[PDB]
Design a protein around this ligand. Sequence first.
Ligand code: NAP
Ligand code: HBI
Ligand code: CA
Length: 186
Amino acid sequence: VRSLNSIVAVCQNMGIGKDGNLPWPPLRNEYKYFQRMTSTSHVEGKQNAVIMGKKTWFSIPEKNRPLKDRINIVLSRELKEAPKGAHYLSKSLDDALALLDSPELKSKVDMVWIVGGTAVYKAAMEKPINHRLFVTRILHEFESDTFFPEIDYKDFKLLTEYPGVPADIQEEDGIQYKFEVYQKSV
Ligand SMILES: NC(=O)c1ccc[n+]([C@@H]2O[C@H](COP(=O)([O-])OP(=O)(O)OC[C@H]3O[C@@H](n4cnc5c(N)ncnc54)[C@H](OP(=O)(O)O)[C@@H]3O)[C@@H](O)[C@H]2O)c1
Ligand SMILES: C[C@H](O)[C@H](O)C1=Nc2c(nc(N)[nH]c2=O)NC1
Ligand SMILES: [Ca+2]
């Protein structure tokens, strides 16, 4: 595709999950941010596409699936068919990327967002394609058992400013965090 976007919320050790869920209790605002970003297309008639792995899909409460107003694509090598609610199943990122370029998807799709987990982020980070990484850095340590892959600081340059992203440190439920945008230009 033209360029990828990835979004993640990470705690201090770069953890993103624990026991199949997020490491911290709910942060309404951080979450509305993930909704607002993944949901908003800049072209009437289109919806964005969200690509995620098996586990991340099942982590979403069942009545809340698929993420409303985005085309849900699940990646799995072990599944034969798109889990109940998913729009599409794909065997790999590559495969997902080609689906997106197909006729029927192409004119339907605005932005592509990788929503994890680890293995999906990694694979996307490695593509020699223009990529913007939206990271929420939660300034606190929660035990995590899943982690965010290492970003190559030589490729992914942190932007000092980006539109519609608060610059200041944020607080909610006694927790502080900040939004950061990393950009890879090929
Ligand atoms: N903080 C955040 O922003 C954030 C975002 C997402 C998830 N999370 C947390 O992370 C956890 C889920 O992450 P996870 O890393 O364990 O799992 P995952 O990536 O969500 O799911 C893994 C499975 O998905 C398929 N898959 C993954 N990468 C693939 C690829 N490149 N090509 C093909 N198939 C691929 C494979 O399924 P098969 O075994 O069927 O082949 C792999 O077993 C939960 O705790 C979730 O709450 C946090
Ligand atoms: C899609 C599911 O909620 C998943 O765990 C994700 N959560 C988050 C995310 N991105 C942010 N910033 N915050 C989340 O809570 N990406 C994916
Ligand atoms: Ca497996």
